[PDB]
């Protein structure tokens, strides 16, 4: 298939992998810090999805240095992946408009 479409799929796979690794690592980083709520895997995975999409509910977040570093990798992976899908959609529409104009 075309590059952009492939890169998108790849982006979707890496993101899913980042979500899972991120959930596991967040718990590992947060347990041990009194007050931390990002300490069980199921909600940590919900936290990972919230972070990747920047939905901003604010119901969960890391309070430790390492947890925050993990958060940044997930945010960037999410913002980048969704942004990459936008670019793929753009390349797709541009190719079609070219045809439609007989170019």
């Amino acid at each position, epitope marked *: 298939s075309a590059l952009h479409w492939r890169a998108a799929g790849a982006a979707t796979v890496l993101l899913v992998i980042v979500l899972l690794a991120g959930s596991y690592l967040a718990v590992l980083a947060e*347990r*041990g810090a*009194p007050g*931390a709520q990002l300490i069980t895997y*199921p909600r940590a995975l919900w936290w990972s999805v919230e972070t990747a999409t920047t939905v901003g509910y604010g119901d969960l977040y890391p309070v430790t240095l390492w947890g925050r570093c993990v958060a940044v990798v997930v945010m960037v992976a999410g913002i980048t992946s969704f942004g990459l899908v936008t670019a793929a959609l753009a390349t797709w529409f541009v190719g079609r408009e070219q045809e439609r104009r007989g170019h």
Partner: antibody
Amino acid sequence: QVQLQQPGAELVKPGASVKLSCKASGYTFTSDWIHWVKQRPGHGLEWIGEIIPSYGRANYNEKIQKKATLTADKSSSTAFMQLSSLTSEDSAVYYCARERGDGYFAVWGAGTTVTVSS
Amino acid sequence: DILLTQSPAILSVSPGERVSFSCRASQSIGTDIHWYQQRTNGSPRLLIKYASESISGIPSRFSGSGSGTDFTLSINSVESEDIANYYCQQSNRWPFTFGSGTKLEI
């Protein structure tokens, strides 16, 4: 079958130290945490600390003096709690429990009764 | 550290009656509260997880309710084998903590 196996007892001299063991069986996941809980005769349950074998990291109760040190052998899937410089205040039943990383202690060992005296 | 208050410390009831144990958290913890039963010389046993979820292998006369800071463990038609100590435990914030326990007496 019995998911967690602990020795029934340990006698320790005041000042000495002992290493409690907890052999686990049944399903095992990298997300498993092994906890240790202390119960003095007549009193309640006191969380001591936890450890995640799949990584070897451990956390301890900060509100109490640190008498324990946790470790785990992934091959023999056994968890250990090193208690050191014990006094009579350390005499109690020490339970180990398994948590699937979802907050609750699904299974507990029978507990090891530790007595500190000469 | 989340403080879990279990009061009264002792609860006396007649056979077959419905009984309720109380557990108050020092701050809101959603439904991240779990209940254990510990009989004489026995080790703790999970009865209810996440405030109201039944555990397979536990009699249906055991149920839980509540959210936020107030939780209740209930036993419908109490019977002799229920004689024991009951503890609540929270997993909302680190570190996990236990309540002081309530003893059931018939």
